[PDB]
Design a protein around this ligand. Structure first.
Ligand SMILES: [Cl-]
Ligand SMILES: [Zn+2]
Ligand SMILES: [Zn+2]
Ligand SMILES: [Zn+2]
Ligand SMILES: [Zn+2]
Ligand SMILES: [Zn+2]
Ligand SMILES: [Zn+2]
Length: 190
C-alpha cells in the first residue's frame, strides 16, 4: 500500500508516527532537521528540498526503511556517519549544496541506484565510491573536479556518468573511458 496523500507537517506526522510513509518538508526554512524525525520508523521518502540545512542529525540512521532522500538546494557540507545505516536507499538527490568532499560512508549505501551531486564544489570522489555496486546513474555536473578515482571503474552497473561543466578536470577523456572499457555506459564530458 502506497501513500498518495503525503505528509507535509512534522508535528502532525508525530501524532501517528508508524503511519507515515512520505514526509515533505521542502521549503520550510529549516536550519536543522529535528531529532524527532527518528520516530517515523516506517518512513520511505523524505523531501527536504530548498531549506537551509548544513547537515543531517545522527538520528537519520534510524530511518532504515528509507528509499528516497531529497536534500537538494540546501547548504549541506557534511554528514553524520549514521548515513551508512540507510541500506534501503535507492535515490539520493544532493544537487545544489555546499559539498567539497563526500565521506567514505557514501559507499555504504548498498542499494543506491541514482546519485545526483550536480552543483556542488567537489574536487574528487572518495575511493569508497566504487563500493556502490547498484549505481546506475551518477551526476557530477557543475562541480570543481580535478581527479576521478580509478575505483569508479568498479561500478559495473553504471550506465550514465555526467561530468558536464567541470573545466577544472584535466584528466584526459580517454583515461576516464578506459576505466569502463568493455561496459555499456555513456559518459558526458564537456
Ligand atoms: Cl521536494
Ligand atoms: Zn497522516
Ligand atoms: Zn523532493
Ligand atoms: Zn554519529
Ligand atoms: Zn525498491
Ligand atoms: Zn542496452
Ligand atoms: Zn554529450
Amino acid at each position: 500500500p502506497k501513500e498518495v496523500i503525503i505528509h507535509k507537517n512534522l508535528s502532525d506526522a508525530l501524532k501517528t508516527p508508524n503511519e507515515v510513509q512520505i514526509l515533505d518538508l521542502s521549503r520550510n526554512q529549516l536550519t536543522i532537521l529535528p531529532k524527532e524525525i527518528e520516530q517515523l520508523v516506517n518512513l520511505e521518502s523524505l523531501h527536504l528540498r530548498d531549506n537551509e540545512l548544513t547537515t543531517l542529525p545522527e538520528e537519520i540512521g534510524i530511518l532504515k526503511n528509507l528509499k528516497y532522500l531529497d536534500i537538494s538546494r540546501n547548504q549541506i557540507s557534511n554528514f553524520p556517519k549514521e548515513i551508512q545505516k540507510l541500506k534501503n536507499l535507492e535515490v539520493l538527490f544532493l544537487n545544489g549544496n555546499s559539498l567539497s568532499n563526500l565521506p567514505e560512508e557514501i559507499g555504504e549505501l548498498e542499494k543506491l541506484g541514482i546519485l545526483y551531486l550536480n552543483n556542488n564544489q567537489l574536487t574528487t570522489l572518495p575511493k569508497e565510491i566504487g563500493q556502490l555496486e547498484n549505481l546506475v546513474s551518477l551526476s557530477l555536473s557543475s562541480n570543481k573536479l580535478t581527479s576521478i578515482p580509478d575505483e569508479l571503474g568498479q561500478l559495473k552497473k553504471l550506465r550514465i556518468l555526467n561530468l558536464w561543466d567541470n573545466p577544472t578536470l584535466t584528466t584526459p577523456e580517454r583515461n576516464i573511458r578506459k576505466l569502463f572499457r568493455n561496459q555499456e555506459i555513456t559518459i558526458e564530458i564537456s
